[PDB]
Design an enzyme around this catalytic site. Structure first.
Site, short mmCIF file in Angstrom:
data_model
loop_
_atom_site.label_atom_id
_atom_site.label_comp_id
_atom_site.label_asym_id
_atom_site.label_seq_id
_atom_site.Cartn_x
_atom_site.Cartn_y
_atom_site.Cartn_z
N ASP A 81 -16.44 -33.57 -20.23
CA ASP A 81 -17.55 -34.70 -20.06
C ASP A 81 -18.57 -34.24 -20.89
N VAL A 130 -23.85 -30.75 -26.31
CA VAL A 130 -24.20 -32.16 -25.73
C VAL A 130 -23.79 -32.18 -24.21
N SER A 131 -24.26 -33.10 -23.47
CA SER A 131 -23.87 -33.51 -22.32
C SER A 131 -23.92 -35.05 -22.32
N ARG A 132 -22.58 -35.47 -22.60
CA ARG A 132 -22.54 -37.06 -22.90
C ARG A 132 -22.73 -37.84 -21.73
N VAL A 133 -22.91 -37.42 -20.62
CA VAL A 133 -23.00 -38.15 -19.58
C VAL A 133 -23.85 -37.20 -18.52
#
Lengths: 62, 501, 50, 56
Positions: free
Chosen positions: B341, B365-368
């Site tokens: 995620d 990134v931390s896409r969520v």
């Protein structure tokens, strides 16, 4: 059966092996308690210092 | 004493009854046996070789059922009988695994006496559905400033640690475990995370040091360490994440929130590669069997933030993938990236550059998740990202003998300070309440002027200063978790006060 | 406590090797024969219960 | 607690700014801060003052 034979015979016929309590003592420490390390004393005793500090310290400007 | 315990153990052996199913080993060696018989047999069952070896069964063939050994070849011999355990692979799961190092089977390899298990579970358990889930509303902060601010980590969420091997790869994860001491020390079960560190494919010495490190920082007392050392069987290694997962599920089921580090997931892939190539399955891309993707996907999706109805119990996952050559185009890294995620790329060059943590924020990134970090810290780090992105752009431009204008050098100067601000020494987690000030100072450019060398000094001293006077302020940041007007002003005044002296 | 626990383990493995010695003692005997008779009748009891 | 002393101290630091000279005033402030910061770190360092003869 074999379970019984092994169990009975082993348990009964072999009771422990030697061990050294003294050696156990060797690897551990009994620890005797620390006694009075340092005693507090009169801070900056001698009013030679006090008069000196009052007179000397005056770092305010002209 | 010892005699009584031994007497109990022998006493605990007694009698037996007719053993159903048999079959005779024929070809055998490598670690993969093939036995003739076993007409009734569940798939993935554990079958007891008469040598003493126990082996799961991965091939059922209308010829010879292929039982993968979990023991040494030397013990096994031709025409041995194997009698089916009658159990699909299963793990003891319980509270007692907290404070225990356990091997894949679940026996303590630290030998702190046999585990206290509240159940057994099965090693393959399918992921919780769409129906039992809540959206991630509970942060979990690693105490590494770059991580918390830039790539916020929330319970449930699978967040991928990827990068070049053992460049403190383990250490990045260990830091998280150490900051989870802070909640652990605290109270409220759902505000606590239990922690399962899974070590697959690593040498006994690394692992032993690791367990020692955890005991040293006295963070061993809420950990489960699942281990499968380098010597240990490729079948045991393949089974190792999945049996860790079930132990995690016991927490998840209890409604407890916990976090499972799967380090290195890359070594699971090597194990499955071996397993498949000696089950003679047609080999996939790069000789990893194609259903490696399936293997990893099913494993990773078992961690989840459950629904309120389903007790919320959040198993959180952190896979760790070694990147051989630092090229993620390799089949296993590509596969994992899709599954996870978020991605937390770490770069070697930045380690050498002295950015420690060496996490490359351009690739991370931390896409969520964004309710996966503290509101206060979100506000302050709102333009931390922008400034850093600008710093990156400006720095890129500066290369190849371009004479920068002052406006670009305002960015550059500001940017450099942020970089120094991020750095943190290994095994030195920080309290978020005291990470919010540091970012406030940086983002509000109070550090821009401050000389590059003494930024570290400023950081140390500033924290001391905040401890001295504004310890009331820190308490509030802990209590309210979003900066109020009063806090912003207090913080502004304090920061201003410390710029000089 | 640490050395005490180590000693409990050490005692247990020493007395363990004595169990191995008792196993070697059992397997010499023509109890090796006589318990086969016991197994024979036991299997008779088992398979008749089937 | 310590915070009453330190708020009044730092209020005085920016007051002492008003007067001239403080080359060794600051060393006095440093000493009181230093050791005050030591005792709190001591008090946080603290172990229970006797053995847990319950478990151990």
């Amino acid at each position: 059966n074999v379970i019984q034979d092994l169990y009975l015979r082993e348990l009964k016929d072999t009771k422990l092996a030697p061990s050294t309590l003294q050696d156990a003592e060797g690897n551990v420490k009994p620890w005797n308690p620390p006694q009075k390390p340092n005693l507090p004393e009169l801070e900056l005793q001698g009013p030679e210092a006090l008069k000196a500090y009052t007179e000397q310290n005056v770092e305010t400007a002209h | 004493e010892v005699s009584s315990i031994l007497e109990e153990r022998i006493k605990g052996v007694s009698d037996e009854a007719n053993l159903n199913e048999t079959g005779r080993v024929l070809a055998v060696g490598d670690g993969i046996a093939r036995v003739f018989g076993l007409n009734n047999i569940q798939a993935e069952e554990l079958v007891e070789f008469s040598s003493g070896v126990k082996g799961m069964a991965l091939n059922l063939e209308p010829g010879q059922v292929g039982i993968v050994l979990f023991g040494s070849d030397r013990l096994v011999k031709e025409g041995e009988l194997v009698k089916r355990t009658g159990n699909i692979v299963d793990v003891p799961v319980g509270p007692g695994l907290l404070g225990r190092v356990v091997d894949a089977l679940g026996n303590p390899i630290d030998g702190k006496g046999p585990i206290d298990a509240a159940g057994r579970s099965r090693a393959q358990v399918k992921a919780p559905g769409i129906l039992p889930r809540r959206s991630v509303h509970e942060p979990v902060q690693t105490g590494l400033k770059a991580v918390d601010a830039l790539v916020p980590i929330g319970r449930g969420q699978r967040e991928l640690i990827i990068g070049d091997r053992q460049t403190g790869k383990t250490a990045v994860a260990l830091d998280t475990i150490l900051n989870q001491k802070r909640w652990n020390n605290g109270s409220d079960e759902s505000k606590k995370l239990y922690c399962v560190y899974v070590a697959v494919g690593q040498k006994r010495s690394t692992v032993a040091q690791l367990v020692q490190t955890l005991e040293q920082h006295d963070a061993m007392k809420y950990s489960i360490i699942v281990a499968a050392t380098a010597s240990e069987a490729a079948p045991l290694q393949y089974l190792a994440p999945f049996t860790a997962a079930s132990i995690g599920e016991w927490f998840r089921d209890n409604g407890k929130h916990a976090l499972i580090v799967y380090d290195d997931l890359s070594k699971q892939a090597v194990a499955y590669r071996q397993l498949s190539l000696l089950l003679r399955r047609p080999p996939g891309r790069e000789a990893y069997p194609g259903d490696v993707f399936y293997l990893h996907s099913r494993l990773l999706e078992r961690a989840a933030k459950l629904s309120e109805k389903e007790g919320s119990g959040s198993l959180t996952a952190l896979p760790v993938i070694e990147t051989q050559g630092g090229d993620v185009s390799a089949y296993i890294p590509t596969n994992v990236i899709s599954i996870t995620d978020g991605q937390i790329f770490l770069e070697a060059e930045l380690f050498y550059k002295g950015i420690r943590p060496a996490i490359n924020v351009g690739l991370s990134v931390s896409r969520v998740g964004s309710a996966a970090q503290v509101k206060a810290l979100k506000q302050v780090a709102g333009s931390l990202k922008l400034f850093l992105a600008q710093y990156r752009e400006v720095a890129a431009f500066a290369q190849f003998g371009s004479d920068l204008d002052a406006s670009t050098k305002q960015t550059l100067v500001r940017g450099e300070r942020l970089t120094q601000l991020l750095k943190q020494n290994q095994y030195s987690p920080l309290a978020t309440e005291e990470q919010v000030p540091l970012i406030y100072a940086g983002v509000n450019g109070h550090l821009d002027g401050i000389e590059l060398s003494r930024i570290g000094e400023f950081e140390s001293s500033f924290l001391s200063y905040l401890k001295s006077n504004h310890n009331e302020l820190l308490t509030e940041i802990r209590e309210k978790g979003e900066l109020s007007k009063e806090l912003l002003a207090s913080l502004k005044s304090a920061t201003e006060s410390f710029v000089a002296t | 406590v640490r050395y005490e626990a180590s000693l409990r383990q050490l005692e247990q493995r020493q007395l363990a090797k004595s169990v191995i010695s008792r196993v070697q003692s059992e397997l010499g005997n023509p109890k090796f024969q006589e318990k086969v008779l016991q197994q024979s009748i036991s299997e008779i009891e088992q398979l008749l219960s089937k | 607690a310590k915070s009453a002393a330190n708020k009044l101290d730092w209020a005085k630091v920016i007051s002492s700014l008003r007067i001239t000279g403080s080359t060794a005033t600051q060393l006095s402030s440093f000493k009181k801060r230093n050791d005050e910061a030591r005792r709190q770190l001591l008090e946080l360092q603290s172990q229970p003052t006797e053995v847990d003869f319950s478990h151990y």
